Amino acid sequence: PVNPEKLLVITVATAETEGYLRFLRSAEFFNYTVRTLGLGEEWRGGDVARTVGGGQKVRWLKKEMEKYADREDMIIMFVDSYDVILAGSPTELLKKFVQSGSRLLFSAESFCWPEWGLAEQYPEVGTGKRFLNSGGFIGFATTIHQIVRQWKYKDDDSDQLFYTRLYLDPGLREKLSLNLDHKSRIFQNLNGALDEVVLKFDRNRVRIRNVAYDTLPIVVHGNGPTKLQLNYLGNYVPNGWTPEGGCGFCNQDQPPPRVFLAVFVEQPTPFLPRFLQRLLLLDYPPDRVTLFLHNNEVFHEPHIADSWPQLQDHFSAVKLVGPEEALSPGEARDMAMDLCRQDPECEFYFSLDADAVLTNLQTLRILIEENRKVIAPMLSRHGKLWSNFWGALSPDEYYARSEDYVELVQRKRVGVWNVPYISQAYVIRGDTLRMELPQRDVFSGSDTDPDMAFCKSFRDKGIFLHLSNQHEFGRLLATSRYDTEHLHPDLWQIFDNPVDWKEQYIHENYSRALEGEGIVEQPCPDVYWFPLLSEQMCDELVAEMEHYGQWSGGRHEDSRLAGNVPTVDIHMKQVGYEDQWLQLLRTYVGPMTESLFPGYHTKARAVMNFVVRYRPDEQPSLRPHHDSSTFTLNVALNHKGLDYEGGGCRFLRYDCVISSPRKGWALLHPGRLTHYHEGLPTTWGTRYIMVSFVDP
Amino acid sequence: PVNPEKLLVITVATAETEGYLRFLRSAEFFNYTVRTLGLGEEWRGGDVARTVGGGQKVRWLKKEMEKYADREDMIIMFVDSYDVILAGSPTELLKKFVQSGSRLLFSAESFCWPEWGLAEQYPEVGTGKRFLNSGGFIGFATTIHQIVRQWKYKDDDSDQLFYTRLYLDPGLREKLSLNLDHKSRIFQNLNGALDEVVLKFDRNRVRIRNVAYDTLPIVVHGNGPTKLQLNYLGNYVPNGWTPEGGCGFCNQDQPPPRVFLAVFVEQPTPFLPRFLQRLLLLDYPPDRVTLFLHNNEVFHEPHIADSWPQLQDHFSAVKLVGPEEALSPGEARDMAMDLCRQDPECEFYFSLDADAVLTNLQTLRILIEENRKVIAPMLSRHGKLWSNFWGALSPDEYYARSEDYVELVQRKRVGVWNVPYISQAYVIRGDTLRMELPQRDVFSGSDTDPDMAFCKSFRDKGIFLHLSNQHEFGRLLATSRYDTEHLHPDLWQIFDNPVDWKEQYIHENYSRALEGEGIVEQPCPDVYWFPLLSEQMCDELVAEMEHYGQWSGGRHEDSRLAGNVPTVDIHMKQVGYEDQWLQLLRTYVGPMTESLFPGYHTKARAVMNFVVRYRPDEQPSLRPHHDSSTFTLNVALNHKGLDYEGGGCRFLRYDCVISSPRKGWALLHPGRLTHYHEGLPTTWGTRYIMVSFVDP
Ligand SMILES: O=c1ccn([C@@H]2O[C@H](COP(=O)(O)OP(=O)(O)O[C@H]3O[C@H](CO)[C@@H](O)[C@H](O)[C@H]3O)[C@@H](O)[C@H]2O)c(=O)[nH]1
Ligand SMILES: O=c1ccn([C@@H]2O[C@H](COP(=O)(O)OP(=O)(O)O[C@H]3O[C@H](CO)[C@@H](O)[C@H](O)[C@H]3O)[C@@H](O)[C@H]2O)c(=O)[nH]1
Ligand SMILES: *[C@@H]1O[C@H](CO)[C@@H](O)[C@H](O)[C@H]1NC(C)=O
Ligand SMILES: *[C@@H]1O[C@H](CO)[C@@H](O)[C@H](O)[C@H]1NC(C)=O
Ligand SMILES: O=C(O)CCC(=O)C(=O)O
Ligand SMILES: O=C(O)CCC(=O)C(=O)O
Ligand SMILES: [Fe+2]
Ligand SMILES: [Fe+2]
Ligand SMILES: [Fe+2]
Ligand SMILES: [Fe+2]
Ligand SMILES: [Mn+2]
Ligand SMILES: [Mn+2]
């Protein structure tokens, strides 16, 4: 049994990057003792993500090893730090090192590099990896000193080639007992072996298993183009997310910092007035928030103009960049982000897109408390898997589904996740914009999509893109085929955005009245009365009818039964709102009717759907008649007294009169046999009603 | 101006027949002074309806004229009496006689008889009648004596030939100034001139007009085969029936005579039990009535058997002649009539057929008060023109429509009418059967129809067949295609006899409840409750269902809506009663529904009509459901407590229960949306209901 007190882990890090801190946390989880070489210094090893190099690591190790030149009692493991996480304990590590029978065990990998021609010099191995990788090795301090002290090359020379050439010396390999971890018993390099690595879960920790060799590696090395795969594994291994503990680093539980809030409207997006009004409700001191709003659509200029006085009176400062600036989305996002970068008072930058609905008013706070450089709240299309983040990339950096993507979207696993792509909503530390991403062309510069260029700019600097589903934050609006050719296009959004359509157009008490609690009334026998449409729905529907303007006249025929009984009206089929109103009937009127008439079942068929107009100059009344319907829906659309004077509906066989109709409320009565009824004359103004003969 | 006191009318009559009395009344109406020759004597003039004769008239006239042989101051008119009516006053008569310039004016007619060869000897007349008729002449008493005193022939010789030969003497015609009433200014002979004679009406008298000559004759002579045409005219001329006075001889306003009442059932006839029960209700002392009933149908033997104890206990005496006697209708009617003839105690004979419905219970009295030899009450098919009498005959003695037939049937003209044919109901004086029609073969003897032989037997004896529409007497049942292949065939008589079908099967309060007066109830909201079917209708409908016996079982489907909801039942289409029940719905349920639900209009369409059976061993209940109907008719068919124990119908949304249904009563409720309802379990016995899903 080798004493873990004799094991020392040595790594190299020229800065306390997020990858290096992720490495330290994994090492501290297993009580490793780690010595970091070169924290204050400048990396002279060259662009290691582009070419070969890393010789500066050997120079610092060689210098460090001189004081351990005679320490046969010490075992030393050298690993990278930016793309390495530890998955096993020092006891299991030293046990496996002794089992190898080696005095200096390098990591093995599938590829022979930098020089391919050296592959013939390598010993033959059956099913295991054959070639050396210098990203991780472990051995006696004396044996390691005898290897690293031969370093005498440039900082930007290849350390992999240096260790490879020494290993391929047949005499030296035999003398010092050099070996390679062929079956990944200790070191797991990810490049060329992604299909061999899977997550092995435990109650309060997560490891990886090599299914090719049935091993549980100690060191996980995301060498080469496997940085994103290591980011994925790093969200779990070793204590990132556990089945019984949840996240292992997230929160899960004085003036606040000043924030630049940037709003982007880059396409015609539904319910923008609701979004602009929602900005006033975000739970963050508005005296600490500066508002930037770029609107690329002339369709939204009136929406922005109506809300701008309230916004300017609310926030510390406001600035609108309208469509007349001819700014591309990438130029506008570069401009807003740079306004925060070039302002030392901007402590955090909050970028919120117009299709992002923030149901959680505490979103800005929660993200700032997470204390990340870049963090995004998880927002999803309602009922769908589409969301504001990607779990994986294709090699061409297009979308790909990750193994745990559906678990994250469905919030089977909650926490703060390191993901390759975020969009639509993210909070970025101001210091990071100045110290690490100082360039202007973050979203622009290339023919790639501005959102992809943004994420790729931070990945190229090793900046993690975090995503939190720790709380419910909101949803994403559908903006795909938003038909703008309407006086009020949001009336037609019942299919694409039903949740927001209900909150805007369905009466705020429809739900409460549907569960009971004594809101629905029965003013006349078997004539029920419930709130259905909001006042905004009534005003926009009436306005949409008058904008059409072609009301009924003579010769018009309706499905009424008396003794022809027409009305001056506009059918939904004429204005193209039939499919929309039939959806309202199925979703909202159908279930209400079955609750008020127990035993009846409805699919809400209705061929007759129309808005009637009553006026003293036109048709002020509607003589007694029946309806070609099982039951009739009768919704008022304006106010009595304010908009019109005159009676409503009278049911003759009961001597009962609905004299004072309520605007958004709807009447529900049988249409045949029993409820012979008549519309009382409108004596002043104009009376609008919406009526459907459902189940004919 | 010739004094009417100098005018004497002379006629011949060997008996005071109805024709002779009709002649006297017309003569007394104009204050004629009439002397009748030969009242007590026997007619030796031969069969004058078959051959030639009448010479006995001249012998009696010649003898009578000898005392007026020198009376130049006297004008004398000789006419027949049996087939003659007077239409003008003696003043107009004498004025026209003087205008003729004749001393002896014979009647003229179209035919030259008995000898045709004498036509050449007659003077030529342009447009008027050319030949002599001895049925009527008028002239001076001296001139008439010089003609009739030359009589020296047999009693059965032709008087027409006697007067013809004297007129055709050119010297004698000139000497005595003999003439013929060519243009019918005084005498109107009907034979050969029926198309020339029309009725001319006044306020309180009726005449005839000869449209060929534009004359108003004084004497109407129904010579030859025109006796029935004179009977027709005799009902009006001169004071028979007038537009302002009505009938001129009918009534229009102590133990009663003993009556033999003969009932004839010669075909399967509907509602015979109702007829037999109606015999007990005729308003005539039953101790004075003897009942004879001939039944030719074995189908009616049970009907006769059920009523026979009550009939025998009611009348003075009863006698049934059943189908086992193998009697033809003519033999049975001969037998019953002869039973009265051969009984001196039979004062009147009342023959009533089974298809005669006597609504007027005072029919036997009213007819006896009319004091006629033979009189029939007018009975008609309901709403039709077919009735129990004929107004005219074809030459082959088949039916023909008379000029006033429709006026009589529609009772535009009411009175007592002399008609050529009666049937189905008539009262015959017993004395007439003994003294004038003593033969047995009244209805039998020839291949002619027994009803026609009956009427022809009385016409051959000069007996008038009278018909009274002075009152409403009743109607005639349709017996044409009476389908007897049913357990209760009268259930299917709703089309052919709707008036009697309603009185037997429709509840006795349906009408009263339909006019209001607070019979209909509303036990549950919009569930009405009215009496519809009588108890006999319910018992016969239930019995007809069980006689079919093939009730529903598994796999049966109904037009009910819940959450399949079947019932053990029998649809009307299965038993062939659909068309019948649909007629009940149109006539009786439709109008009731429109009265109880003002504004609704119904044609009573119903594809689902069925009788449900509830039993504890079978299907005792009917779970909650709706109906494929606008409204549902629910009629009980038996008694609760007596026939079954268990609840009825429960309407869930109202917490209202029809716990105690009434047998013949029907429920009327909506079938959709509001009246989710359930049939409570029948715990004992059997519960029958009739249900229609009307207006689906
Ligand atoms: O600015 C830097 C860059 C790198 N490192 C360190 O150098 C190591 C190597 O960088 P890495 O991102 O892990 O590159 P790799 O994808 O692992 O590929 C490597 O492959 C060889 C063997 O691992 C290395 O010597 C080369 O630096 C490099 O090309 C990092 O982990 C860090 O520990 C720094 O301390 N600072
Ligand atoms: O049993 C009788 C039959 C006849 N008459 C009288 O004779 C008259 C002639 O009888 P009728 O029925 O009128 O015969 P018609 O159809 O008029 O035809 C007649 O035509 C000749 C001229 O009128 C008559 O002499 C014949 O009797 C007769 O054939 C009657 O009106 C009676 O006045 C009797 O008094 N008793
Ligand atoms: C690490 O050491 C601390 C004491 O320094 C001890 O409490 C803890 O249990 C150790 N954890 C592991 C995983 O060895
Ligand atoms: C008939 O005579 C009576 C008196 O004898 C007279 O009252 C009546 O008016 C007369 N009628 C006619 C029609 O001449
Ligand atoms: O005017 C009303 O309130 C009734 C209108 C109605 O029922 C209809 O539109 O058919
Ligand atoms: O059993 C009852 O009273 C109800 C029966 C009924 O409504 C039906 O026949 O559908
Ligand atoms: Fe309309
Ligand atoms: Fe209506
Ligand atoms: Fe059925
Ligand atoms: Fe029912
Ligand atoms: Mn590395
Ligand atoms: Mn005659």
Author numbering:
A (entry chain A), B (entry chain A): 33 to 285, 293 to 602, 606 to 738
Task: Copy out sentences from the published article reporting this entry, exactly as the authors wrote them.
Aiming to further elucidate the significance of the differences caused by this specific residue in LH1/PLOD1 and LH3/PLOD3, we generated a LH3/PLOD3 p.(Asp190Ser) variant to mimic LH1/PLOD1 at that specific site. MS and luminescence data showed that this single-point mutation completely abolishes the LH3/PLOD3 Glc-T activity without affecting the ability of this mutant to bind UDP-Glc donor substrates. We also solved the 2.30-Å crystal structure of the full-length human LH3/PLOD3 p.(Asp190Ser) mutant in complex with Mn2+ and UDP-Glc. Overall, the structure appeared nearly identical to wild-type LH3/PLOD3. Analysis of the electron density at the GT catalytic site showed clear signals for the Glc moiety of the UDP-Glc donor substrate. This feature was never observed when using wild-type LH3/PLOD3, further supporting the importance of the Poly-Asp loop for Glc-T activity. The side chains of Asp191, Lys89, and Ser166, as well as the main chain carbonyl of Thr83, were found at distances and orientations possibly compatible with electrostatic contacts with the Glc moiety of the donor substrate, resulting in the trapping of the sugar in a portion of the catalytic cavity, leaving a large pocket shaped by residues Glu141, Phe143, Asn165, Asn223, and Asn255 available to likely host the Gal moiety of the acceptor substrate for catalysis. LH3/PLOD3 p.(Asp190Ser), matching the corresponding residue in LH1/PLOD1, resulted in strongly diminished Glc-T activity and yielded a crystal structure with observable electron density for the donor sugar moiety for the first time, enabling the identification of the amino acid residues directly involved in Glc binding and those shaping the portion of the cavity likely hosting the Gal moiety of the acceptor substrate. Whilst co-crystal structures with donor substrate consistently display no density for the sugar moiety because of uncoupled enzymatic hydrolysis or very low occupancy for a very flexible moiety, the inhibitors show density for the glycan part connected to UDP because hydrolysis is not taking place.
